[PDB]
Write a protein that binds this ligand. Structure first.
Ligand SMILES: NC(=O)c1ccc[n+]([C@@H]2O[C@H](COP(=O)([O-])OP(=O)(O)OC[C@H]3O[C@@H](n4cnc5c(N)ncnc54)[C@H](O)[C@@H]3O)[C@@H](O)[C@H]2O)c1
Ligand SMILES: [Mg+2]
Ligand SMILES: [Mg+2]
Ligand SMILES: [Mg+2]
Ligand SMILES: [Mg+2]
Ligand SMILES: [Mn+2]
Ligand SMILES: [Mn+2]
Ligand SMILES: [Mn+2]
Ligand SMILES: [Mn+2]
Lengths: 494, 494, 494, 494
């Protein structure tokens, strides 16, 4: 039961957020943000650059000074504040769900039922962690009392993508704020609106000035400024593997700030012959087409056992063909437009490469509307490992279906990738589930399911899909600076 | 009561260690390792470079293959092997203590009682972690069974310094091997002998070929080869902040391998007026002069309250003057020579800089012997924050003594550094100890003691002194790759 | 600045709570609950017995059945429910604060600011734990995948006292509900009203029927019925050491249900000569006189160093004499009446005993008003260890001041008790604080403070003061049953 | 590879172990220990009673005094000693393996390869936990520094059974000693020899006097003295559910000492139709017949799905018939004699009762030899839930085979028991394994395996099979007393 959306939600925030105040970029320059469904401009947004980031870092640093409201605040109260933020977000759930769709292109029903639900669940999860991330008392040798203090890492720079604007923001603010840090966030230029509105709610929730600062702008400008800043203690990046490299290099070249990376992938979805056919087909479809295929953990390599290959392919094609593409605000819509023109063109480029390489085009393969960035649900069959569409992240509605024979074989092929963000196994056999779930070199391996995210279960990648983990208790590790205090005592006893 | 050392221990290992075999460099080239006490060459060592590193990485990769002896081995048995290694090291304790001194210069009494004790204690500590670093079963939403697998990160490249050859090796091998990883270790060209011998013991301990591979050689050559290798999953470096940046840069430019850094520092030792004078004076002396002042956490900025300044300085100068400098094999010797000519010259350069800037030279200040790299225990009084000797890591027997008035003042001054490896507070007052230990931005804050390391308590830096932590349970984080496995279940129940 | 209290709150709940419904005792019997300030009956309450408890256990058991709403409910949602319960309690804070005073006698200012604040904090704290008490994935030998499920203990019987009605209820419900258990609670016959109203809010909060059942009644009847019940999986009791013995015996004689006990004590408050006099005096007074001295961890043994003894005693008597005793609803009141006539008489008996034994009565020692159960703040000086008032829990406004000389002496004397719930050390010296906090055999040692409770810090007794802990992460251990699942896999790897 | 056993090992220890010395009972009385294979007396053993226990408790209490060798010892050193004890046991493996069989009756091959291997693994495992059971630093509200100290519980009474003499000793000594506690152990009168010899090794290993005291004797005498002792802080019992209740009552009646219990069971071994027949048959045989059927977690209720019932029974009967019964020192021997005459007769009694109730006797059913306590491997078919042999712990070579149809059916039938120690599920289906492993109310659920014990995985019972857990990290909870130290600080900061 979803409330009726406002298909033209008003924009109240489009500037730079620093010290709980709205500012225009120092240069006074702005950039337009487009509605991917119409190709039309929504509004103008403050284009932050290095000088703006510098202002934000100074505000954050200030808020992190020993004896400041944020440093002196009870850990339990940070939990109250995070829960309050979640309440304000839920209060404006219908509005944000619409604004998310307006700016991003994803179906409103999904923004409402999936996106914001996961935002609330994440913040509320982390509100619980606020006063429970214990340090330790250590049984060190000699007459000493040793213990550790789990302190905040300090000023954290958080750079996020455009595929899940609100959720990606939540995945960052939740753990950072729960551990007492201060942030300077760089939202994606393609989808800055929703995160900016949340900042208004952060001020309403009562978070002290400078605790959270949002700088909307471009990557090589605002982004690089954060990653290279001499006073940024930590940087958390989510985006392309390519920019992940740029981020780590910048950290090493600057002040050696701690780094975590949530990059891309080419996750294999393995379908064994003893799989529940209906279930595997519907799930494999979701595994790839979810969020216009714009998901890092997209099951873009569907390996199907040869015995059930034909039937699986047949049903998959049928399901893809029936997938309703259209205006994201229409409840009938299963797939909206791609985020922007650049992405739209890149996907079309890959589709063309798929055909050129000899991949069997089974359906779709072209534009789905003469307005907006709509692409037809595309399916390629008989894909080979060496093919470009089987190695590179397409980030669109393009499905690769490969055929395999043995379990040993599929393990090697699934693992022969520089990525390793996710993986999936569909089987009814206990031994096969365990054999594969252990053999697969991926951050997350789903069995008889896909895209199952839990604020309590960590998510991150193996190899070049990233480093470090988000969500769960693990998501706190990167936002903590450990201090050992070893005190001399008159006489130590057990 | 140390056993009689063999002042001229024979060298049995001087090559490259790969697959439990000794190999000459592909180029057949060798480099000499010198005895800092005599300036004479001890022997020739195989000079490993990129091609040799590639041989080691291939060996380690092979040893990490699913189904291999190392991957199939019980975690508990890894602990057995680590305890075995420890036994072999304890059997050859006097030999290794002597060889350590021969190649490093540090007093034999210290190599035996301190260095090798801490090696044994670190290895035995981690042997216990081998089968206790549990993953988790998570209470995720929906009908799913979610749990994490704490897998080894993979091929770990480990680059270490020369100040504590054996100890630094242990600090790395302990956690890496305890978690089931394989390594390619690059020992310091100045002190490669002992670590190579330990490799012999690893083979005798029963570790499978390729699990631990050691490549002796230079930094820009062997070291950079490791940090830039496309098949090294993680890299752990300990050394200068300068090279730390090169390491992180190389990681980002290559395969995005995980990185932890244990860099240098300019640690402040704070002496409050209510401190036990005698203890503070002796501890302060040890805090700086320990290991010829060649310790990362050396208390190179001794802040003393104005009320007890004069007396503390007087007593400090007296203690430095009586510090016996001589042949490291002489039981009377408290301080041996600096590791090499480069360090020798660099320290002398800093001493000259101290004088040039107006720092009051109180004692020492020059060469202590016409043979070997001996430098006199030097003390500078009335040091100011802006002076070079008050800002840069001298890494030699040079003590800086500064005067302060208030506790708020010393906090700001102590924290006014791009370093933050350690710190110390000497006071009898409960409130002062707590206030200071909290306020100080250091990775380890010692209260009424200094240089108290515990295999159970984490060690690492804040700011540019590094990232990550070694020792304790934390030492295991960087050597684990988390895998979330979420399985679909008929119906989840609490 | 507390809201004006309704000095005669209306009672809405006075029956037995089962399956979210109100029932009269099967016997139809009722018992009166008295207002200790007036001695007048407030109202009648349903007198539950064995048969009523049998109904409650059946309801609880039913709600705990696999597949039931409560068992299927997401752990995160349990958190939501607990946070909701907390909001309702806060909504009705002014009413509940008043009712707590009317039924218990403690000052309204304290019920509002202290009691209810701690209720909220406890509940919100535990709401956070709901989805974070992870099980483990274990690195067992051989080809097996071993892990542990942290399941609910099941049906938990919870018996609580009357000194902190609301608080004692929260400390029991928070951890139990957060872990997914169902409870059958037996509230103290002296103060049953507030807990009954909270049951109403539990229904309003949305907790499934039978998850929380509350049976008001007497101990030998209702309490024993729960303790000896063949279908209660676990019992958590808080009360006198006497009854704790009865509870553990009952559990052993019945179904071997798991038991944890929070009994009484005779906690020592040690005042060293270098302690801040003003602070020590005010704190020691609070340590004993808090909640009319009706606190399990009251510092009933104030040890003061001989050099500052006379001064401390003099100030203490002055503080006790100025303590305003009166109508708990009058904002001027610091001390209300004892809970009931039984306690009133028991305290009077202890006061007479103290005089009889030769303890120097310094002030008070008699009845404070001719109506209600008010007793004058009493102070006994020169108390000796063998004295009864120095060994037994008085649970009334009767302070015992003992004199000591050395620190070794006081340690032995403080530990010479069968109790060991809490202890306190007042000193400015770092070494004294560490020496004593380690030496003292007490569940909680406060340094330079008293009665500092934190929903995140455990609380429990050493020796006969109890077993198991409450609050903190520790409070969840007793509400969890661990299940090890060891699965056979094709080939185990790290 | 099994070394040749000494069929008549000499006995060196047969007295009471207190303060590292051997004592005769105060009464000078002794009791005989019989060789179950011959019925002949091996030797006389000191008969400890209350007065002896009192001596042992006084010795243990002394060794636990603050400032004592054991209390001051480094946690890591405790680990050294535990590993030392393990080495000494391995040195005397062959001897202890023989003496274990001589006194217990189990096959020597099993005593060597299984029993002593598990002892060694348990000890070495816990040696590792010595310095890793961290306390916590807690984020409490207000200006305070709160942390917890994980202290030893104190004097621990440990009463164990006779089925696994050495192993049961290890399971108790490992966790207790690793946590710094002192023990008073009451070994089974039936098998006291081996435990007394290990006491010798304890002294040789270097454990301080009074740390481990061993009192051989009877239950109602020595055992009850321990459980009822006013100075025993905690009791850990492993035996019959019946005595478990006596133990808990004793603790409640005395000083409210902490209690954990490892009682018996009537564990279900569920074989679904899709199970690997050969494997299920061989494992089910092992599940019951292991250690002459004298195992607490014995799969005494073998449920088999109707479709594979006949085949399963046929094969099981054939396997039971071929099971070689004989002299435990003969390599061919799979099954030795029962521990003693009492068990021998009790088991025969149950066999009679089984026939009486209409259970289909398929094989065995009587005495296997006219000397010693040998019983034929017995199998009963068509067992019904209501039968005595399907409800009571037989603790002998008597197999119960029940037939079932559905999975929902088998869950309720398996759970319909007051016991809940273990359970097993044999199936190839992933969903069935997870459904059953979650549904079964057992402390341990083995999937496609049985009797898989891991020092790292917890073991304990649900319901009346016990409370608390042994092995793994959990095994340390019962041996730790949590102390919370809450210190006032000038100003708390994150
Ligand atoms: N924090 C410490 O423990 C520590 C250790 C060593 C040196 N220092 C500082 O560094 C100075 C001396 O240099 P050093 O040799 O001791 O340290 P370093 O940073 O030069 O080298 C440490 C390790 O890194 C290797 N290495 C060198 N260049 C490398 C490169 N480009 N890429 C990869 N690896 C490389 C070296 O061979 C060695 O194994 C001292 O004067 C002192 O200021 C601090
Ligand atoms: Mg847009
Ligand atoms: Mg050298
Ligand atoms: Mg009352
Ligand atoms: Mg016997
Ligand atoms: Mn981009
Ligand atoms: Mn260098
Ligand atoms: Mn009572
Ligand atoms: Mn018995």
């Amino acid at each position: 039961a979803v409330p009726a959306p406002n298909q033209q939600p008003e924009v109240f925030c489009n500037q730079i957020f620093i010290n709980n105040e709205w500012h225009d970029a120092v240069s006074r320059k702005t950039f337009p943000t487009v509605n991917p469904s119409t190709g039309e401009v929504i509004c103008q947004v403050a284009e932050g650059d290095k000088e703006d980031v510098d202002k934000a870092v100074k505000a954050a640093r200030a808020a992190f000074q020993l004896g400041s409201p944020w440093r002196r605040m009870d850990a339990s109260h940070r939990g109250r504040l995070l829960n309050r933020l979640a309440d304000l977000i839920e209060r404006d759930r219908t509005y944000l769900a619409a604004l998310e769709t307006l700016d991003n292109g994803k179906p409103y029903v999904i923004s409402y039922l999936v996106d914001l639900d996961m935002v609330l669940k994440c913040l509320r999860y982390y509100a619980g962690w606020a006063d429970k991330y214990h340090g330790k008392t250590i049984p060190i040798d000699g007459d000493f009392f040793s213990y550790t203090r789990h302190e905040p890492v300090g000023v954290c720079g958080q750079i996020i993508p455009w595929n899940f604007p609100l959720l990606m923001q939540a995945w960052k603010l939740g753990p950072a704020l729960a551990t007492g840090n201060v942030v300077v966030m760089k939202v994606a230029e393609q989808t800055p609106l929703t995160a900016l509105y949340v900042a208004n709610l952060i001020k309403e929730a009562g978070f002290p000035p400078g605790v959270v600062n949002i700088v909307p702008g471009f990557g090589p400008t605002a982004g690089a400024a954060i990653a290279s800043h001499e006073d940024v203690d930590k940087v958390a990046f989510t985006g392309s593997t390519e920019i992940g490299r740029v981020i780590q290099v910048a950290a090493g070249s600057s002040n050696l700030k701690r780094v975590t990376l949530e990059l891309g992938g080419k996750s294999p979805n393995i379908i064994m012959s003893d799989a529940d056919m209906d279930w595997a087909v519907e799930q494999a479809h979701f595994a790839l087409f979810f969020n216009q295929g714009q998901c890092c953990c997209a099951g873009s390599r569907t390996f199907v056992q040869e015995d059930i290959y034909d039937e699986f392919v047949e049903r998959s094609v049928a399901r893809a063909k029936s997938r309703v593409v259209g205006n994201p605000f229409d409840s009938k819509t299963e797939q909206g437009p791609q985020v922007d023109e650049t992405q739209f063109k890149k996907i079309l480029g890959y589709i063309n490469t798929g055909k050129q390489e000899g991949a069997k085009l089974l359906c779709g393969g072209g534009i789905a509307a003469d307005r907006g960035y709509f692409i037809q649900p595309t399916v390629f069959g008989d894909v080979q490992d060496g093919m470009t569409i089987a190695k590179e992240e397409i980030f669109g509605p393009v499905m690769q279906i490969l055929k395999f024979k043995t379990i040993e074989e599929v393990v090697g092929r699934a693992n022969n990738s520089t990525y390793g963000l996710a993986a999936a196994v569909f089987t009814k056999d206990l031994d096969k589930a365990n054999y594969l779930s252990q053999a697969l070199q991926a951050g997350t391996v789903w069995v008889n399911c896909y895209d199952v995210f839990g604020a309590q279960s960590p998510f991150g990648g193996y190899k070049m899909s990233g480093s470090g983990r988000e969500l769960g208790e693990y998501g706190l590790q990167a936002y903590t600076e450990v201090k050992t205090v070893t005190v001399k005592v008159p006489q130590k006893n057990s």
